[model samples]
Structure formats: structure tokens, C-alpha cells
Target: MAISGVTLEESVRGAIDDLRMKKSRYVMMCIGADGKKIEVTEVGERSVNYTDLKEKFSTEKPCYVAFDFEYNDAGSKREKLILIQWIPDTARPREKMMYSASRDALSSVSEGYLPIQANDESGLDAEEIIRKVRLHRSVAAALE
Candidate 1:
């Protein structure tokens, strides 16, 4: 049914935010595999299904990207820019009982810390990001 209203970038960003606030994990930015587009609200909101994505990207754990959700071809979807900051393993060791740190970081950013748009300082163009995504092997091969 029309993939709802969430965009791919929003979905990825949402996942990152969810991990931080809900699970206390800071994931890095992982763009969808080439030609991969994900739509949030796949399981009716507050949930994400990465079955096909995990199978395709095994060894990729809880990736910041590299997943697929729902989308529509004739839906005229819009592309978006995404940026994420993951707490490094060296900093937390993935063992420390510091879920609060991740949660706070995400909350703070969601409030106004992380930058999610393409600007001069960020050094990225929106069109370029979409172009690169489309070049993903699966996407490129499909178009070819």
C-alpha cells in the first residue's frame, strides 16, 4: 500500500535514533546497498524488518544502512540525505554498562546536535548520494 510517508533516509535515520534511545547503541552511517531503497513503517510503525537485507548483507550486523523495507516504483518517492555518528567500540567496548550514554547522545542530537542535511561543511550533494546508491551492483545490473 504506497509505502506510507517515510523516506529511505528518514527510515535509516529513524533506525539509528531508535537504537540509541531504545537499545542504547550508536550505529554508524551505512548507506543502503547499491540500488537499495528502504521505507519505514514496514511492520506498521516503530518496527523494521531487515530479513532480505540481512541475508544479502550477512556479516553486516545492525548496520546503519544495508537494509531494505517497503517502497513503490510508480510512487514517485523522494530521495534524502542521511548522516550518523556511532559511538566507537574503542570508546565503549560494547561491554560497558553505558547504554545511557548512547541514549543521551541520540536524544541530544535528535534535539539539536547531529547534522542530517547536505551543507558546505558536510561536503556532500544530495543528487550525488542518490546517484551513488543507484550504482549499487544490484541496481546497476538491473538497469543494464
Candidate 2:
């Protein structure tokens, strides 16, 4: 610690700087049931300001989309994950859920989010759906 001359503040600053140096990535999306195709883009710790998206999706029918967000961290292998949720097209807005990335058996974060059903596959654990989603969205950290 003494040798490096790195304070806690400096370390945190360094982390933030590292995070800032990272590039922004995005995913294209298509809504379900007569809804149009849209994109949900993300930058590092950026805004979720969905006015454009919300305005685009404002419709009368039920609309949904499946999302695949695959990205590599610091040039390492990408994590392939899925998230399915309704677009903000209803008269009343619906909060969405993001799913977990499998560094285990899958790869490529599916090459920039595809519009597919997240849990459409069989054998997915129903009990852990919400938990998995939360973890995938980074709302909760994994315990080692």
C-alpha cells in the first residue's frame, strides 16, 4: 500500500476512470404482437431516459420483446444473457426484468441482443426466475 502511493480515493477514482474508458454497447429489439422494432442502447452508467422509446412504443395492444445482451468485459470473453419484458406500449407502463448471462455454456452475448423469448425454452427453473433476473441485471451480486 505504501509503495504504490494509492489512496482509497485514488483507487476508486482509478476504477471510475477505467470504467469510463470502456466503450458503450447496444442491442437492437423488436416488440411482440403488432409492435414495431426498437433498440435499447446503453452507455457506461448512462441514463435510462426512454422517452424516445416510450413514445415509439405508445400503442393500444400488448407489446413485448426478448433481449440478449452479450458483451465482453475488458476484452475478455463476452457473457451471453437473455431478458424478456414488455415494451412500454400499454396505457399503463410495465416495469421490465433483465436475465442472467451464461459464461458457463453459452457465448457471444448472442452477438448483440436478439428479440427472442427469454424463458421460452423448457427446463428453465421457474422458482428462481425472478432471482436469476435480478442477478442478471446486476441488481444483486453473486456470492462466491
User: In model 1, how many backbone clashes occur?
Assistant: 1
lDDT of each: 0.31, 0.28
lDDT of 1: 0.31
Instruction: Give one digit per residue, the lDDT tens place, for model 1 in 49-95.
Output: 33322233322122222122122223556222123222233333321
Give the worst 10-residue stretch by lDDT in candidate 1: 60-69
Give candidate 2 regions above 4 Å deviation. Answer: 1-56, 59-61, 77-79, 87-144
